[PDB]
Amino acid sequence: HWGYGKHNGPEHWHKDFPIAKGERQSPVDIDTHTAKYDPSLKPLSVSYDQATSLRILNNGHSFQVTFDDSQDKAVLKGGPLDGTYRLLQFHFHWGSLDGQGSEHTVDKKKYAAELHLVHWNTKYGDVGKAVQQPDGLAVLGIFLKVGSAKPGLQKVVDVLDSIKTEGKSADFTNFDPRGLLPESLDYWTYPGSLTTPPLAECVTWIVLKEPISVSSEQVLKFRKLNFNGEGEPEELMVDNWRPAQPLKNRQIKASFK
Numbered sequence: 493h494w495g496y497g498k499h500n501g502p503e504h505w506h507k508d509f510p511i512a513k514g515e516r517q518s519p520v521d522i523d524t525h526t527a528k529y530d531p532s533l534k535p536l537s538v539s540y541d542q543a544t545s546l547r548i549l550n551n552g553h554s555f556q557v558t559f560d561d562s563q564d565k566a567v568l569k570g571g572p573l574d575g576t577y578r579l580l581q582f583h584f585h586w587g588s589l590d591g592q593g594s595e596h597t598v599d600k601k602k603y604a605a606e607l608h609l610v611h612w613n614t615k616y617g618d619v620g621k622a623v624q625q626p627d628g629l630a631v632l633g634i635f636l637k638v639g640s641a642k643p644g645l646q647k648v649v650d651v652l653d654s655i656k657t658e659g660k661s662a663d664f665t666n667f668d669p670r671g672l673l674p675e676s677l678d679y680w681t682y683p684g685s686l687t688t689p690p691l692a693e694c695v696t697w698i699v700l701k702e703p704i705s706v707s708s709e710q711v712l713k714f715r716k717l718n719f720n721g722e723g724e725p726e727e728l729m730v731d732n733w734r735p736a737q738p739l740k741n742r743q744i745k746a747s748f749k
């Protein structure tokens with residue numbers, strides 16, 4: 493089964509998921525000087541006030557906080573999007589050291605981690621149908637740098653000891669994802685894909701320019717998670733990022749000058 497190791501990592505994924513070599517794969521390097529400012533792009537609308545988190549789960553490749561997406565409770569709209577996208581889950585990608593971990597890069601710079609808030613287009617009714625559509629999902633990507641702590645992240649990091657190994661989950665209610673957002677909603681956007689199998693080419697990517705800062709203690713907690721299930725040889729869940737993929741025939745647009 494796929495993973496991030498030498499024998500099952502991103503360089504191997506194309507054998508089970510041939511779309512890995514497709515025309516709109518993610519992540520990509522964001523070349524800030526080539527991205528074109530698009531004045532037609534609208535401000536992002538992030539409506540998270542009624543978000544209902546449900547569970548936190550170690551799925552063997554990341555940890556994920558899942559939300560009630562049976563109603564228009566926490567929705568993404570505007571920006572480059574047509575229509576309404578419901579928040580399903582957020583998760584992170586991070587490194588073994590602070591100089592790597594993000595999936596997208598900015599002028600080849602890697603951040604310590606990257607937060608993905610995953611939303612799906614309500615016109616397709618459920619996320620399984622949305623992943624089969626070129627505009628089915630919108631993922632909001634936020635870079636993490638190491639410095640000052642992010643207070644809104646602490647409730648997440650403090651329960652990670654309870655989901656150390658693959659398959660473990662816990663109740664995780666009343667978590668407010670607004671505490672993970674930076675000040676600015678300036679963004680880059682391009683058409684791309686899921687960055688884990690099945691690598692489906694269904695994602696409008698919205699990557700925020702402004703990182704959030706997290707503390708070393710916070711990201712050290714990420715690095716204590718396990719890829720393995722309980723009872724298997726301990727393999728730290730670190731470096732769970734796919735590297736930048738060829739941009740091919742795509743334009744990255746910027747919402748800001």
Ligand SMILES: CCC(=O)Nc1nnc(S(N)(=O)=O)s1
Nearest residue numbers: 608610619631685686687688
């Ligand atoms: C449909 C469930 C789901 O969200 N799958 C994802 N697969 N890759 C994602 S990423 N790393 O691009 O945000 S999300």
Ligand SMILES: [Zn+2]
Nearest residue numbers: 583585608687
């Ligand atoms: Zn992700």
